[PDB]
């Protein structure tokens, strides 16, 4: 398993409510 | 704020939607899946994106994540004659 690097940006990547 | 049209449209639809996109687009471009130069994932990722695009998956994801977000005169405007 390798790392898919990403960024926090709506609506692309969000932390779920109660992450 | 000068930002990408995609984020702009998304925000302009979100509550309290007190923002608005003004004018057209200053240019045209696109987002691509990146890989380190010389990667072994370069070809499979390209073909995966082509498959996702030709199968309507990207349009559906876009539509799901963007579109689905969605009297009497008072004393204030006649106070002059009262003054």
């Amino acid at each position: 398993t390798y790392i898919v690097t990403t960024i926090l940006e709506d609506p692309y990547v969000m932390l779920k409510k109660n992450a | 704020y000068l930002l990408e049209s995609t984020m702009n449209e998304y925000i302009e639809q979100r509550k309290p939607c007190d923002t608005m996109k003004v004018g057209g687009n200053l240019d045209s471009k696109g987002y691509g899946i990146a890989t380190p130069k010389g990667s072994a994932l370069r070809g499979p990722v390209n073909l995966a994106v082509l498959k996702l695009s030709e199968q309507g998956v990207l349009d559906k994801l876009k539509s799901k994540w963007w579109y689905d977000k969605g009297s009497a005169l008072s004393l204030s405007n006649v106070a002059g004659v009262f003054y």
Binding site: - | S63, Y67, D68, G70
Partner: protein, 48 residues
């Protein structure tokens, strides 16, 4: 069946209607048809 029809719908209009109904306050839903009938009759044309 009507609530379940709206919940599992995939048509844009029906999905929009479901998203509105699920997050509407006070609860738009009712417990019986008579309840909805009286709600429309006593909402003075503000309930569909």
């Amino acid at each position: 069946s009507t609530k379940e029809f709206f919940r599992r719908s995939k048509i844009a209009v029906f999905e929009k209607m479901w998203t509105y109904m699920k997050s509407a306050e006070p609860s738009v839903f009712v417990r019986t048809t008579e309840e909805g009938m009286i709600r429309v009759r006593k909402s003075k044309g503000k309930y569909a």
